[PDB]
Structure 1
């Protein structure tokens, strides 16, 4: 079964021959589709497959080298219950994990990833060092560079290395007596965990949280990022002179730190990664979602729009100007950022590159299509096939 995939804008069609090699762990069946679900989910066999992928990538499949690596991997597994990846294999796997991520619209840059090997890490203190270096390299004074830092793999009879925060840089969410929240509502739990672990909080709306880092079988320890390491952008609007007076801002580096990296059957519970922002992520979701900063009303009011009726599309106008504020501000502060039109246009290219490369691309339509102006971007008119290939980035339960 090679699903026909059609682009309704140009009428072109392709056949996804790659899906037939995916993992049968999706939530859909012939009876019902569960694709809108946020959470849709032998070591030897997985390892062998990954080793095979690796040798094919360097074009040395079937070589003595390939054979040796297979026997070696099997020996380690049969002898220890796990195995050790080689440095180049790790770099290869990390890049495929990103490449394979169905929900990522920035995958055309997949081959340009900087992997930091942090597998000889021994303490949360060293963990903090590796993280500060990651933030330094990646942030790069605003000319952001994609990177990932891989900490020790999951071990037989050993606790995991875990970063409790969901992102390396997050704003505190302080729940008020009156039920409101000062800061980011999405971060109330982690904020309260930091406080409960000894952190003295700061009553601000954009207070960068400390890191709660965990080494195998240890309580988590608190670590404060130096202000100098955390680049932020103050928000202003090119024409709405009053926007700036709102005192809004956002950090430069989106670094996801709560997902698990799986390469050839091996699991790395702590393996932070980051690229750069796509405007809708901040402008639409972070700032306009009712349970996030929730600023639409104030902005609409300041724009003096008719908030009385829904047909005035006050919400649409405010949202758009806020996304404009984010783009303008990042470009001003000279911090890397890409808008949804450019982002999706590049993904259409990535899809083309992959059809020629692997004969298909795992994509999640609901996440690829932007939270605003969906039909105005080319991906909306593009049919997609969603599946789970490996290596991969996966979700995992919170460590507490």
Structure 2
């Protein structure tokens, strides 16, 4: 019934009781664990998700059962009855947004869950206006390098009609251009998205860090191409504290990590375009983005500059180079005065967050494989921490690509 969660470093032990407020099923069954997969494959249902969410809200501001709580429940019943749907009040939205981040099992930065700038964008009618909002969000979130976490929430989905979508997977993304030789200049992860921009009229550059434009989609209309004003997009050239040759690799990364393809579910309403951003954890860039074989895959290159022995694996040239790369990122950011958090600091404050959430809620859904960073795993306290994963609502979801 209630599972026992141990830390193998300290011998400490908790019991997750939060996991009973899970109303949504995951992929595992008693017969096989599938917890390592990246993805899945009526008035009544909405009304109870809403009732539950409203109760969560009035609880969150300790007014459960009071006057405004009663009339608000009746307001919702009344609106669903007559229309098959309802709408959120600004504050209610702001609550749900904070809560869906709080509930995200794969986010290691949740210590921050309470500090979130919310832009109400539900009064959007054109892709033009989407672009305007997307630009104010960026200017806000970037703040000359002192990064502030943000979300912008575009109009909810509606059964009569198509969705507001941002086709881009991230507001800021580097193009991936497919060469004659069947190789890739730029980011391999963004090949298909770079192809769409082009087909919808974009003139492409041909460097390895060409910021893609945005494809914005208003209901039931063709998507529209908007170029991001280059001064909004704060980038960081990568140099290395001791290695003078590093900078000449002309490596660089963008400051703002802002996901833009996930759906935000609150009280069983759905928000198909609701981009969110915080700040990077170094490993995201130094390890995944630059060292993944199916990304920029710079490991061999760097290591050769370091003059390490590539011939065998036991000289540990991959690990050696991986470290200098993450190192380079941290220095470069810290030097350009842009918010960055290394994997040690981040995981330490996630242990803290686990402890906060323990006393506050009786648990914390967490996805161990995603919370443990991609280098130096066991070197970080989270490695040694048993974790329970489950789905609480409000939530972010994956949704299908609009095309």
Q: TM-score by structure 2 length?
A: 0.99
How far is 1:233 from its partner? 0.1
How far is 1:64 from its partner? 1.8
Residue aligning to 1:177 = 180
CA RMSD in angstroms comes to 0.6
Distance in structure 1 (CA, Å) of the matches to 2:94 and 2:72? 16
Distance in structure 2 (CA, Å) of the matches to 1:78 and 1:220? 34
How far is 1:155 from its partner? 1.1
Matched, 1:12 2:15: no
Residue aligning to 1:223 = 226
Residue aligning to 1:28 = 28
How far is 1:364 from its partner? 0.1
Aligned residues: 400
How far is 1:129 from its partner? 0.2
Residue aligning to 1:323 = 326
Contact 1:362 1:388 in 2 (8 A): yes
Q: Secondary structure at the match of 1:191?
A: helix
How far is 1:112 from its partner? 0.2
Q: Secondary structure at the match of 1:374?
A: coil
Q: Secondary structure at the match of 1:310?
A: coil
1:226-276 Cα deviation digits (max 9, x unpaired): 000000000010011100000000000000000000000000000000000
How far is 1:79 from its partner? 0.8
Q: Secondary structure at the match of 2:314?
A: helix
How far is 1:40 from its partner? 3.7
Residue aligning to 1:194 = 197
How far is 1:23 from its partner? 2.7
When structure 1 is superposed on structure 2, of 40-49 and 247-256 the one drifting more is: 40-49
Q: Secondary structure at the match of 1:145?
A: coil
1:299-341 Cα deviation digits (max 9, x unpaired): 0000000001000000000000000000000000000000000
Q: Secondary structure at the match of 2:378?
A: helix
How far is 1:157 from its partner? 0.6
Distance in structure 1 (CA, Å) of the matches to 2:40 and 2:360? 27
Matched, 1:244 2:231: no
Distance in structure 2 (CA, Å) of the matches to 1:302 and 1:104? 34
How far is 1:156 from its partner? 2.3
Q: Secondary structure at the match of 1:312?
A: coil
Contact 1:34 1:40 in 2 (8 A): no
Residue aligning to 1:294 = 297
Contact 1:212 1:220 in 2 (8 A): yes
How far is 1:187 from its partner? 0.2
Runs of 4+ deviating beyond 4 Å: none
Contact 1:81 1:156 in 2 (8 A): no
How far is 1:390 from its partner? 0.2
Q: Secondary structure at the match of 2:5?
A: strand
Residue aligning to 1:381 = 384
How far is 1:159 from its partner? 1.4
Aligned pair partner of 2:170 in 167, 170, 176: 167
1:333-368 Cα deviation digits (max 9, x unpaired): 000000000000000000000000000000000000
* Runs (5+) with no aligned partner, structure 2: none
1:148-199 Cα deviation digits (max 9, x unpaired): 0000001121211000000000000000010100000000000000000000
How far is 1:24 from its partner? 3.9
How far is 1:2 from its partner? 1.0
Q: Secondary structure at the match of 2:253?
A: strand
Q: TM-score by structure 1 length?
A: 0.99
Residue aligning to 2:361 = 358
Contact 1:127 1:213 in 2 (8 A): yes
* Runs (5+) with no aligned partner, structure 1: none
When structure 1 is superposed on structure 2, of 22-31 and 287-296 the one drifting more is: 22-31
Distance in structure 2 (CA, Å) of the matches to 1:14 and 1:316? 35
How far is 1:25 from its partner? 1.3
How far is 1:373 from its partner? 0.3
How far is 1:66 from its partner? 0.9
Distance in structure 2 (CA, Å) of the matches to 1:47 and 1:152? 17
How far is 1:38 from its partner? 0.4
